[model samples]
Target: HKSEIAHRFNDLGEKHFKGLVLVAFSQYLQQCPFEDHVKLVNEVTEFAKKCAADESAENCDKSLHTLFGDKLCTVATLRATYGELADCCEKQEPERNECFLTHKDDHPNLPKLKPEPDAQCAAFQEDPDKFLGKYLYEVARRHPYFYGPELLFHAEEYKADFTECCPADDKLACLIPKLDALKERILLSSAKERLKCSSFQNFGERAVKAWSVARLSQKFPKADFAEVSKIVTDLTKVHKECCHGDLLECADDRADLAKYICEHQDSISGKLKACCDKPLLQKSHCIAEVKEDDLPSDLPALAADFAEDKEICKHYKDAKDVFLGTFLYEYSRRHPDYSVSLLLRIAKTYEATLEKCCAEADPPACYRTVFDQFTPLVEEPKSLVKKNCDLFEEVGEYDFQNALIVRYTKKAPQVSTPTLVEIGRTLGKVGSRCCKLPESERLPCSENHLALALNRLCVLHEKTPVSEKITKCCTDSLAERRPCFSALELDEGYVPKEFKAETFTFHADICTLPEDEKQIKKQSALAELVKHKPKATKEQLKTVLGNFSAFVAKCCGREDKEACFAEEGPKLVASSQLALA
Candidate 1:
């Protein structure tokens, strides 16, 4: 009878438990701290037994607190909420389990904690379990909706990477790159899994097709509607053939995909040209490496096809893939500056709304307002892109780049210093390239290219999953790009305990470079300075640059140019810091 009760509770919870913890000892291991894992699981199992066997055994505070205490909040709050499911637990097996599961309170909001990055190698060397435990805990807490098994997979990968890398001749050289690669794979896999999970759960098999269409269309934005649909169909077939997690199928899929893209290189031009131009073996890797392309000039903007049409639902019902695929394809082709992830989100919203509206009593009336809902999604990004471009136009190249660095650094302090410097340089190059273009072509050029730069930044920051606020900002369309990043608040919890500054001093090799190269080096220095002193006013920075330039002119003419710069560089940096302060 007790065995029957436990099985009934498990079955009921399995179907509808959602993010809540309802499983036995297996699930408990994923959420518990290293020290408490055994004891907590044992206690919880016993409490579950008690609840199963005895009608009056509803008080499970001893076990619940032991299980969730570290994961949640204070003991007093835990005590206050322990009886949340008491009444539900008094019911018969199936209903009792359903009631207890449904009646479970939301997990108390925990701070988004992340394992600090600096001492990961040290921690791994000293005690691998402690380090992996912290890593798993942080990941689980941040993504409560993510499955425990999936999270443990990430932990297992982390352990494997560390085990292989920690003893290498260059531990950092080994671990950092491998972990970064792992982070990318994790992010990509998790995103696809979540999208598929939601699509299948919320809408069904049809919605999954819609998701793939929206996602792939953004990925290959320059591909025509016919080509996009063909790509979707081909990929779907490849998935069907190869999605059993087999190496042979994966190899087949990769070879075919590379072959397919290489043959049709004309559509995905800008980046893919370089990719396809590579040698046969490298072509596949190259194809995977390139970022999404900008929209070509000839592709015209598309109007919403389903708006104000009474037969829209009828079309969707009969052929969801064609209907939603065309919608995503048209929208993606029209909005080339939108990030791939943002387009995925937009398509998701459209699908969700359509699902709701099509089921309503008056389907046409319900969906008539659907396009209205998409207004903010479409419009906000537009204005954000426009505002950034307007600022770029108003300020010339150097100033605009400097201003952008300051804005990004101040707004998103969680961004690492090296990343900040890299972004500064990337933006300087972008502004120089695009701001000099004719006014009419400037926004289109700047907006398209800026996304490519930010896309790299997004990929670069994958190691710090807790910095999701910036990730969301990074994924917005060009319209939302600058404003989204500019609106970011510093993640106070994510700030590192110590900081190191990049050297401002340059040797006479800077002066010896060719004119164009020297100019680039000087401009990069200014950008670096902006990142170095992100709080400084633009004018103050300009003053520092102006002073540095005047000093460089004199120093370069001297017999001891290298010595002159070496001596004076620190003084200038100090003076600049004073002015900035």
Candidate 2:
């Protein structure tokens, strides 16, 4: 603990060492035997003298001298407590000696510590106040040592630019996420390592601010000590309330793991299926990990697969825009059912907007505002799902779908996602035929199923806890029953004021029957019409009824037979008028 803790501060110049040594002194003063206390006091005072030129360093030295009285540790005080470890820190530089204390188990499965700081970091020795330099220096000065030099250096590159990564209004909800972005940009070996490093960085940032406030109060004295105690109380309360993931013990680690799914999604999604259950901290070394770069989808990464021509990418932009503007507009014109393809389509719209928004001659600047307007629809498809299907917990972001499937793949008994993904192309092909209906026909048949079931279920509930359910099948499955629920637009909310209410099961099996078997349904329709309108002349009804096959073959193609014939004889007479084309 002494060697490793000292090693981290070694790079921030001598001043940091003064702070830690003082920390050690104040903590252990009473415990040391006389000779040991005397030796260590000399050791500490000598170390403090080396830091006397700089403010923080000098202040660090002051804190020690003020408490210890003189540097002598004459009876052996310093050595028993600290000096034997002096040469231990010579592992690096012209350092006065640095020290800190941390739990032995602080980081697990972290990258091996580098022997010294990076060559890139020496710039900080001169300009330690540069944002990047200061932050790096601060973390080195205050964070845990297990964030080996390389990890800290690489992690700093990300934190330096993402300074606002944590918030000021700062509830744990948003604060944890900003810190999470830091872990995402910097990869680590395990979730614990990720969380430890992120927590270290956050704690480091706050600790630096706390020290600044303490130093300001140093100008005060008796009340200064009082305020200092208050400061300590305030800090303890904050630290006590800091964020830990509700989902896992290793939240930041899990978030980084989420980031892994975002970047390596194409490669690691399969592994994620399994890892989701093992631990929030789990990730394999063999995987091709990357720092987080939010993409609407994997398509940008797939851009590498594109023909690398400016025109080709532009062409994709064109198709993507048209697809976003025209395609979804066309489908949603009537039925706005969302599917996986829309997510990809919306993603490509982002690809196009990013790749080609207003980048030219008259440009789309002729269409400039269109670009921003177009951006929302592209962004909306996801939030829409997130809001509806996978918000937050299912937050339905990049991991939204991943989470939806992971639950089933990780814990579901009936089918694993791998099996579902591989075993099912039939519906994908069936959806291709959904294109067959020009989307309008898509309802109540292909896209719509158990259509009548959903319709009646609502009605049953309208008057329900009425005797029996509107539909016998899954009146319980209203939401489930919707996607399968297809119908003539009118029947969706209609119930004959007084008519024979028949039970209908809304299930895929309802339509899977042989074509002839399903045709048998027209008879039930014919019976209901006459049954409800008993006043109809049996003779005239017989004339129209005999021609049922011809009437259906012709008018049903473009007519809502059930709903239009709703008025009975008069509308039935009109429907018969159109007869067949």
Candidate 3:
């Protein structure tokens, strides 16, 4: 029956047909009708069976053309022999092998399907680890730029976690070789080992890990095991009370969890006690900081901005890969010890792959190919790692240029990113090139241009920006485009840093009352002052306000307020302490 045939082919294709089998089948069935679906499916099954039967007996011109049309030459003139047949498809047997030999160097990306490993141990075994920054990249470069993240992701998978894996204080020579092998054997044999092979380079993938390991790394940069064993505690209850299983994954919106911890970082430091008794940069490998009655260390109190535990990871996201090559390569340049050659290879291969398949096509296709190529590496065993004599310099600068360009171009009314890429073709566009501009004149140049771009988008005359008026406490006549750009650049967190009237920006020199309002600025500033010094009575606030009033009098009358304040006001409150009263 027609129905039976239709279902059979559909079901069989769904169950057995994919990849080359699907490609071969669709081409073979092009000559047949859907009514003959059973025959269509059968022919593909048999064709695949035949191809696999001898693995070399079956060859199709279509398959050859699709895989490497440019590589195959015109061999019509060569008269072939049967017994000693030189099948052009079978490399090395004569014409076929000759073609491979000829173009092998040219089409180096001709899939090698490298052999599988022995234990099929976890992702970061020493085999791949050894080859990570070195050999792995050599083979991986046959891909494209977008494949860069996955390449880095693989490196992340295999990375060693000194805190979790080794005895601190052990010599690198004595500890590393054994750990690498033991991990492999454990990975092969065990069913329920820990996720040492997790992300954040497996130091600790989530917040608990980031916080704990950071603390550990600082205290024991060399990771002495004896000191470590004394410190590591079961933080299960702490973690549970703190947040969820993945605290670091959800709370970037400081309004959510982060606010509760660091919200009053400054205004109430003296009230709470030991603000930075534990370094802002340190975490507890079960360490203690600022215990009860501990004098707020003669240190700046901290707010949890750096460690974003309890804050953000998402699913089914586009997770842009095209910029991955740029990210990884640029990151490696900044961090040599953490470098991986495979990453550059991936980004390099993409340059070619983009031209071949999706050059003139949608970027989405190339993005998908990036994932397609590296996914297998993520799943299967790795066996090509070795050693690294390199060290990663701890520079903190990152190239926000591309992502910023993308974000601006996609959202801004100014000229586009693709436009910049086109214009800078000769000068080398920021993202397309290998290096992030050094802390140079170029960065300032870009920022100035950015200032101009923002000004173009600004309305120039201010009733008030539809958003928060950052400089509302300063004089109104002083409204200018510069202040707006300055406001735009401030870290847009700090929910409480606003006026009580309608919420104005800080910086008294530039802040001003909106055309429609008043009083709120004074109230809000007073609110913060009182809260900051809760014990201070009403008279103290009045004195502070009077101090602030004269502050505005001199500023509104004088353009040199910032400079004069140093010479004028601070000497009033504390004879050189120029600050809010």
Candidate 4:
């Protein structure tokens, strides 16, 4: 065990090594009588120094066995848990102590350890503190990475439960359920510890503090950085109690964060209104679970001086977390439509750009021009999808599907007609479903499904020989694939020399079909306008379709319907061709 301690702490340096020893000494000394405390401290100090110098694991183990063999399990387990607990060690004394109590190894898949053997009635009557301390040690040894204070917190509960249950004649009935109740709290604590506190474990104080400000500020854009930071710092203090295995304190702190948002709800966006409507504590849970709202329409674009400003390099060099946090908080609030994934990508690209430009001969110039690289990343995709959706809304579903089929078939003529039609159907279905969503959901729905809509086209072309442009579009990353397809130049020379306009005959019988079939025929007739004049601009094509719809309505009920149709249909075709001029 001494050798294990040596192996773990040998490189931790004197301060941390002695720190672990102190924790071990204090823990074990609590299980012994008061008189042994002074002598035990000296023994522990001597053993630590000896272990610090000892190179041989076997020799150290033998020496430990000779001096303090009964202390073996305690020493071994403390070192293991403390190794895991060291993330907290560099923090201030109070926070470090709280962190030690709160941080425990997460082993969700492991079987639950058996409850300790029961003799609580007599043990409690004798010396409750000693019994609890020993009970804690038993628990800690089994869950080797659990800290002492967290174990003690649970041990006290056991002590309380035993006191109440012990007087009962049927002690097992009362005790078993009480023990089970503690396990429930333990599982809840473990999950929160993983979700909320693991970042503290991994990134330590500064990064988590910066991240909290960035994320919370994005969520509540009305709050200035100073206000958000203040709230974050206060909420973080709650971690001192919350993370220390105290469920009640954790609840109070969670409620406080939720309460603050609700209190300032009027100043913030209305997205959190439903969450705020819940009762106090339930509001906290609701807020925690809610996704981020859309960026407010009134928020201005990000300041244009970011890269060219001389101050950025200083900020980046001195405090990288705060700088990046500001970048994230600023960019996210202005562009709330960007998914969390793309927002992160933008920040990553900015950071890498700065990394290269800051060290160059002309930093401002380098930053200004080099930053141009990621603009196409955002603007091109945004433009294409925005344009695609506008057409979907303007031309309607059947026309949109036909337009897509024309688009894919023109670009990759080698791809089978059936495959192109299926791809068009898939994309059109998505557009039909997403475009009709409420205003708040429409953009996100369209942007999210676009990659999925193109998957079949990419798959179908992978098996066939195709042009370089087709192959390149297929190979592009899913995030960039939509833009790649949009960038393809349609084969203007490949247009058919003649197209039949009777496929869209607007006879009086056409308007008399079932409502569903009538609408289908009308939309299919509109699609033929796009196919007939593939060279026409969307607006020009829109004008021709508008005239077609008007002429259809006027001619459908005419007694001279065939004459009305034959005369107007040729005019619609002529308008489609002439619109190109």
Global local distance difference test of model 1? 0.55
Off by over 4 Å in 3: 1-205, 224-233, 236-239, 242-286, 290-548, 551-581
- Which runs of model 1 end up more than 4 angstroms from their true locations? 1-227, 233-305, 309-322, 330-346, 355-363, 373-399, 432-445, 463-468, 471-486, 489-502, 505-534
TM-score of 1: 0.45
List model 4 lDDT by residue over 1-581, tens digit each.
Answer: 44644543353334333333333444332233333433443565566567767746344554322233234223433345455444454565445545544443322123334443356667777887556655554444333233323444465567778888878888878888888777755543333333334445434565446545545666667656656667778667655434343322333455566677788766654677898887553465456545666556676545454665777788899988667877777775665455433455567678888898788877787777645666766665466566877888887887787667656655665555556666676677667877777644565556545544454455445546456777776564333455677677767555542566566556667767765456456555544555555566655655665677788778877788878877777776666556644
Q: How does model 4 score by TM-score?
A: 0.36
- For each predicted model, how many residue pairs clash, with residues at least 3 apart or on different chains? 2, 29, 47, 0
Clashing pairs in 1: 381-479, 385-479
The number of the candidate with the highest lDDT is 4
Each model's C-alpha lDDT? 0.55, 0.33, 0.29, 0.56
Model 1, position 2: C-alpha lDDT score: 29
Model 4 weakest 10-residue run by lDDT: 64-73
lDDT of 2 at 159: 43
Report the C-alpha displacement of residue 492, candidate 2, in angstroms: 38
Selected candidate, larger lDDT, 2 vs 3: 2
Runs of candidate 2 exceeding 4 Å displacement: 1-148, 155-183, 187-581
Put down candidate 2 lDDT per residue, 334-427, tens digits, no spaces: 2233332332333345445545543655443333333344455435443433342223332223222222222222221122222222212222
Worst 10 residues of 1 by lDDT: 15-24
Q: Estimate each model's TM-score.
A: 0.45, 0.17, 0.16, 0.36
